[PDB]
Amino acid sequence: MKRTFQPSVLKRNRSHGFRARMATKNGRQVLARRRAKGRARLTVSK
Template sequence: MQPTFRPHRLKRARKIGYRARKATVGGRKVLANRRRKGRKRLTVV
């Protein structure tokens, strides 16, 4: 059996990175919510 989770930084960044979030309306809402909450890091990558 192969492992189900094989992390890759670039792939992750393209999916859930800052620029990916800014590209969609929903993503911008996520960033706005995290800013309002006062998160130190807006995106996990």
């Protein structure tokens, strides 16, 4: 039936995109944790 993931790009990027993280204290802490674990990509970007 209608499942849980109905994808949208504009949605995806406003919610989790780079800039969206950088907006806030918490977000920059996420990006800190990721850079510390050494991910391939931090956020969802194209």
